[PDB]
Design a binder for this molecule. Structure first.
Ligand SMILES: O=c1[nH]cc(F)c(=O)[nH]1
Ligand SMILES: O=c1[nH]cc(F)c(=O)[nH]1
Ligand SMILES: O=c1[nH]cc(F)c(=O)[nH]1
Lengths: 171, 171, 171, 171, 171, 171
């Protein structure tokens, strides 16, 4: 059994709001001072990459600033990577995924990240937080908090990846 | 120069509340069973270890449950560990520290923790969150959120370690 | 399904009786002379440790004597150890577990013990003997002899560990 | 001061009774089945070997079944081995010694035994238990329980080994 | 022969005095800082470790301060080590032994200690100074100065080790 | 700024007293022997060497005995050496320095010494002890104990090294 949690319009509005939170919180709009570092969005393959790419698109549309974005493979970090020109050294890296659950993927991403470089800081953006974290990891940007039973599943859908925008829950 | 954020009485009341939050959230009080894992408090040296010991004491006094507690040395995980007998495999491990700052100490603790065993989940408790995180790490239990400038310093004082309970800020 | 072998009151009366047997059999309350060894309780994780801790407490209450007690990790002795101050050399060590079955856990304890020191003697106390030994090992103190089939399971519950006292058998 | 605890006739009656206990308890004359494994008697050198050999003779005389028997050297297991064809894997091994005292020799046999194979279970048979065990080890078959002071000695004599059957105590 | 230098009551009163000297001299009661460093007691195996543990208990009882305490093996430093979590860097380490003689054991401890970390300072506490030093090493805390000949031996007894507290001299 | 702690006459009187203490304590003028080892003074470069040399002269003047004396370089022993004919094996070695402070130089000397030979024993003589030791090292001969703040400096002057005898303190 399945049900719609977010419509295509819902996801659009939320992704847009997330993009503006990012702009607000990083001030990427400003002349990048000493204490205001360049932003890089790295998505967790593969739908996380889709989300990071769209966020990058939105931010460019709203601010005129082109933020670097890529992908961070975590296959070899569980108990192809693509980094923008300029790397991540002393940058603000925003890890991006579609769903935050136990948090174990994000920890893998943190591990993977240090084989790449040394960011000034790392943030996390997700479309959905479905709870039941198993590590003290939290998203800095959350599209929607979706309370779930352990037996339920949350399914994020993005146009470029799955054919439609939407979020569905099933049991 | 210097000023008091928490009195000894403040620290006492706050620690007692955290202990009850832990009891509430883990339900260590009711008969264990399949769905309630044993809880282990691991402190980050040294005041985190002090705080962990006090929390364990408080928890036993309020619930009658003896929680395992120890210390997690993180020296070889930056830039001797003490785990209660029976280990931490499939336990709910709560990392304990006095101050949450950048979060890098907590990350080191997670790394050290992974060379020790495989917990069911890991939570984090701190007396003070002074902001300025550089990782997407957040405490599940927080004594007090203390806004600070980077130039300021937070000094937690615990009786078993410093002769008195209290939290002071300096510049 | 499930059935009760011992009520909480049962467990209390029995643990108290065991405590007094130990005191009687070791004469630990008498003025320790040259030829009368100090008693050390080492529990096998985890409920054996709970049981060892409670017994030590009981012994102090009934005799005023504080016996050293700790835990003996046997994980690397099958397929962190905690030894009280003064160690176990020339001591009378009482291994404590909740259930005696095949006896292999106890034999592992004997192996683990031999990497710790050389006691004068080793005894064994258990809450329940459910039979079916596969080694010539027997307990010196037994809470209750419970005949069981190979298909049954024995579940000991102790207050400090599980919130309640009791022993149940299931099939 | 010397004194006789058991006459030759005593030893004879007692060894014969043990043989029948073994036959009864292992049902070795019945068809070897899942819960009825082949029996192997291994004596501890050297008089234990004599006793194991006698028991095998008696068992054959009473049941017509020839049980495998040999010796288990424990020299390299303290603080020449001879195994019957078919080994001891999944067998019921009965360790045999003349006197059970501290229990340390038997523990050595247990250690020595696992460098030989994996028995289904291990039992222990001794002619005399003189008490004062220093380990939680007990014999499954005991010829005679002989109370002794720490200063007394128990001496087993078997004909094939010493020239007579008998048991003597000295101080 | 043998003779008593200190009674159990003597040892208790003296150990208590040492504990207060340590508290006074380190100002352990005051907040850990530059002029009051964190204290760690490291005992020399084996009775030195027990004594360190006893001192820690006393200090806790008198001051409420829980001092780290452990053991420093000096086997590999002549002609099992246990360090509390957080190590000894910039700590005040107090080496503890039962008897100071030639001073060679203490020097080995000093060597072993720098393979562990870099303390702010190192002090020494002993129950007995038996004279005859062969190095310019002296204890900062001394229980009793006992004049002895080269042919005499001093035997310290601690309850957790020997059942009683006491100091005897023999020839 | 500065003030005089010891006049040239003071230093002369003190150095003379130290020489006689050495003679008294080592009995170097007596017919040597098994339990009376030859004395060797080794100074720490450079003013310590001057003091050792002056002491040797005094001892010779007062006793007629010529003690071997030299220098012990400690440059390679932190964080030209000259050893008298006959070496230091089984000798009584007296390390000599002008000022004893933290004691870290003296420990280096003990380390430097083990690369030279094996003395029967090692003593230490200094003109001034200004306190603030960071190790359990003490001088066996002390010219003068000078209480000082950590912010002060102690300056020893010897004629052969600096043109005059004296001790001055500055802040
Ligand atoms: O049902 C799903 N399968 C795989 C996915 F990645 C997802 O989001 N949802
Ligand atoms: O007196 C004895 N000597 C040797 C033995 F093996 C024994 O059992 N008794
Ligand atoms: O300035 C100084 N030079 C050399 C010294 F030995 C001293 O004490 N002070």
């Amino acid at each position: 059994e399945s049900r719609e949690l977010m419509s295509a319009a819902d996801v659009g509005r939320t992704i847009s709001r997330i993009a503006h939170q990012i702009i607000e919180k990083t001030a990427l709009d400003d002349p990048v001072g000493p204490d205001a570092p360049r932003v890089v969005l790295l998505g967790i393959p593969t739908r996380g990459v889709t989300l990071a790419n769209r966020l990058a698109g939105n931010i460019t549309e709203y601010s005129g600033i082109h933020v670097g974005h890529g992908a961070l493979d975590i296959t070899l970090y569980r108990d192809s990577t693509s980094i923008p020109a300029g790397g991540i050294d002393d940058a603000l890296v925003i890890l991006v995924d579609d769903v935050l659950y136990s948090g174990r993927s994000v920890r893998s991403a943190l591990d993977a990240l240090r084989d790449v470089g040394r960011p000034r800081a790392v943030q996390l953006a997700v479309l959905v937080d479905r709870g039941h974290r198993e590590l003290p990891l939290r998203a800095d940007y959350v599209g929607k908090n979706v309370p779930t039973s352990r037996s339920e599943s949350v399914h994020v859908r993005l146009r470029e990846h799955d054919g439609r925008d939407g979020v569905v829950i099933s049991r």
